Design an enzyme around this catalytic site. Structure first.
Site, PDB file in Angstrom:
ATOM      1  CG  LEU A  44       2.024   5.248  -6.185  1.00 25.68           C
ATOM      2  CD1 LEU A  44       0.993   6.179  -5.578  1.00 25.68           C
ATOM      3  CD2 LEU A  44       1.564   3.802  -6.078  1.00 25.68           C
ATOM      4  N   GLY A  45       4.267   6.469 -10.016  1.00 22.69           N
ATOM      5  CA  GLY A  45       4.465   7.005 -11.356  1.00 22.69           C
ATOM      6  C   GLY A  45       5.522   8.086 -11.441  1.00 22.69           C
ATOM      7  NE  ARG A  46      11.816   9.956 -13.132  1.00 19.89           N
ATOM      8  CZ  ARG A  46      13.070   9.569 -13.351  1.00 19.89           C
ATOM      9  NH1 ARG A  46      13.328   8.342 -13.789  1.00 19.89           N
ATOM     10  NH2 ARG A  46      14.076  10.408 -13.136  1.00 19.89           N
ATOM     11  CE1 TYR A  49       4.305  19.181 -13.316  1.00 17.64           C
ATOM     12  CE2 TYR A  49       5.038  20.350 -15.269  1.00 17.64           C
ATOM     13  CZ  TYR A  49       4.010  19.911 -14.453  1.00 17.64           C
ATOM     14  OH  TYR A  49       2.712  20.197 -14.767  1.00 17.64           O
ATOM     15  CB  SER A  50       5.608  15.416 -10.578  1.00 14.67           C
ATOM     16  OG  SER A  50       4.894  14.857 -11.670  1.00 14.67           O
ATOM     17  CD  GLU A  51      11.391  10.300  -9.010  1.00 13.39           C
ATOM     18  OE1 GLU A  51      11.600   9.860  -7.856  1.00 13.39           O
ATOM     19  OE2 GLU A  51      12.300  10.469  -9.855  1.00 13.39           O
ATOM     20  CE  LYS A  67       1.966  16.570  -9.059  1.00 13.85           C
ATOM     21  NZ  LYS A  67       0.781  17.408  -9.354  1.00 13.85           N
ATOM     22  CG  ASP A 155      -3.771  18.420 -17.839  1.00  9.75           C
ATOM     23  OD1 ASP A 155      -4.011  18.033 -18.998  1.00  9.75           O
ATOM     24  OD2 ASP A 155      -2.839  17.984 -17.141  1.00  9.75           O
TER      25      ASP A 155
END
Ligand SMILES: Oc1cccc2ccccc12
Length: 326
Positions: A44-46, A49-51, A67, A155
């Site tokens: 879905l996204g990158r 520090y996370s895929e 995640k 955030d």
């Protein structure tokens, strides 16, 4: 003799009257299930520090979001898991469904409820004045709830607000920068995305609170009603404050830094300048007038204030005339 102390006007002692197990995330024992129960479907996204992947739980045939957190820094993951578990089930909070590890890689992975997200650039063009009021109220429910639970997101931004517009469903996601509020605690100011950083972080005032989230929310509201994204368009952390000053004037910045006995970094010396306080009506144009109202402007004015103590709390914001129609 250093900066003047400050504390939250609401939920000040919620963690103090709680047992350490609730906010002592370092001591929290994380138990990781087997990732074999989940089949990854598509990326879905990158992140840094996370895929993030869309997945299927093979035991019940339900779609989930996985995640794969890159173990860049432990304790931070402990902090995120502890916060996610504390808030689990709260209004408009992303549900942490499971915590797993792949047997071979041993990589940590968080499993969330699936949200069928509407693209922000697609949403931003179809939303009416009512839709903005509706979704802003949904975000306030999530914020008043996490602040009541002694937690500040730190955030708040459009990309961390997932909306399934067809189902009018909203989730506040990414709690990896969230922290437990403890009165008098000095926090790291390197939090939030540049455009949504509150003046306290830019002037390096460490004794901030839940009100940081109310600043960020104000930035989002301004971008939405004025159709200007982002509103405070800084090019660096130093410039970001200069952009805030270009709207709220340089008089209140000095009044704010004097009230809290804040020492301005010498990097601000040649870039800060001298600016005047602008009327919010100056941002109204033909392309955004259908989203603006005196109520919207009065509400924005009460969120976007230099003084973190002077900003509306999430509970006060919910009582504003801007939400009478919701
Ligand atoms: O409709 C909105 C109102 C307030 C915040 C939003 C964030 C993302 C996408 C849409 C939003």
């Amino acid at each position: 003799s250093g900066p003047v102390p400050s504390r939250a006007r609401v939920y000040t002692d919620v963690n103090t009257h709680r047992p350490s197990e609730y906010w002592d995330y370092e001591s929290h024992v994380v138990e990781w299930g087997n990732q074999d129960d989940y089949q990854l479907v598509r990326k879905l996204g990158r992140g840094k520090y996370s895929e993030v992947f869309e997945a299927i739980n093979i035991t019940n045939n339900e779609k989930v979001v996985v995640k794969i957190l890159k173990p860049v820094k432990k304790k931070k993951i402990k902090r995120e898991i502890k916060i996610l578990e504390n808030l689990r089930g709260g209004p408009n909070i992303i549900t942490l469904a499971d915590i797993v590890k792949d047997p071979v890689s041993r990589t940590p992975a968080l499993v969330f409820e699936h949200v069928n997200n509407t693209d922000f650039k697609q949403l931003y063009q179809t939303l009416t004045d009512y839709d903005i009021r509706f979704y802003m109220y949904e975000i306030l429910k999530a914020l008043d709830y996490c602040h009541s639970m002694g937690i500040m997101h730190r955030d708040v931004k459009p990309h961390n607000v997932m909306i399934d517009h067809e189902h009018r469903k909203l989730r506040l996601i990414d709690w990896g920068l969230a922290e437990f509020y403890h009165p008098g605690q000095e926090y790291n100011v390197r939090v939030a995305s540049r455009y949504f950083k509150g003046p306290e972080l830019l002037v390096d005032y460490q004794m901030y609170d839940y009100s940081l989230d109310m600043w960020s929310l104000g930035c989002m509201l301004a971008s939405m009603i004025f159709r200007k994204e982002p509103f405070f368009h800084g090019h660096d952390n130093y410039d970001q404050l200069v952009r805030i000053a270009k709207v709220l004037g340089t008089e209140d910045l000095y009044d704010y830094i004097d009230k809290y006995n804040i020492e301005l970094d010498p990097r601000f010396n040649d870039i800060l300048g001298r600016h005047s306080r602008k009327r919010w009506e100056r941002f109204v144009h033909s392309e955004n007038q259908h989203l603006v109202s005196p109520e919207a402007l009065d509400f924005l004015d009460k969120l976007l204030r230099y003084d973190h103590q002077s900003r509306l709390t999430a509970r006060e914001a919910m009582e504003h005339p801007y939400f009478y129609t919701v």
